[PDB]
Design a binder for these strands. Structure first.
Ligand code: NI
Length: 84
RNA sequence: AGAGU
């Protein structure tokens, strides 16, 4: 069995934080062709991994702690703006 | 309203 990813150690000073969302809004956070979550990464200077379709709906957000926190808030605000 | 070789 093969795949096309691997697990990498963070650079020193960079943390990875698990951002859980409701199951029904994973696709909403990603957006079409990733447009929403690519924008959040670009705006917050973070690296984000979308959960697998068959796993818990937890994004992993990697970067400086202050940037990761901003990305977390961007994800939560995007959800809230669309779901109230 | 699911992007990544
Ligand atoms: Ni392959």
């Amino acid at each position: 069995h093969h795949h096309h990813h691997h697990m990498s150690p963070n650079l020193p000073g960079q943390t990875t934080v698990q951002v859980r969302v409701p199951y029904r809004v994973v696709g909403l956070v990603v957006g079409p062709k990733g447009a929403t979550i690519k924008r959040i990464q670009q705006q917050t200077h973070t690296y984000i991994v979308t959960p697998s379709r068959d796993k818990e709906p937890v994004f992993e957000v990697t970067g400086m702690p202050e940037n990761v926190d901003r990305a977390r808030e961007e994800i939560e605000m995007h959800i809230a703006m669309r779901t109230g």
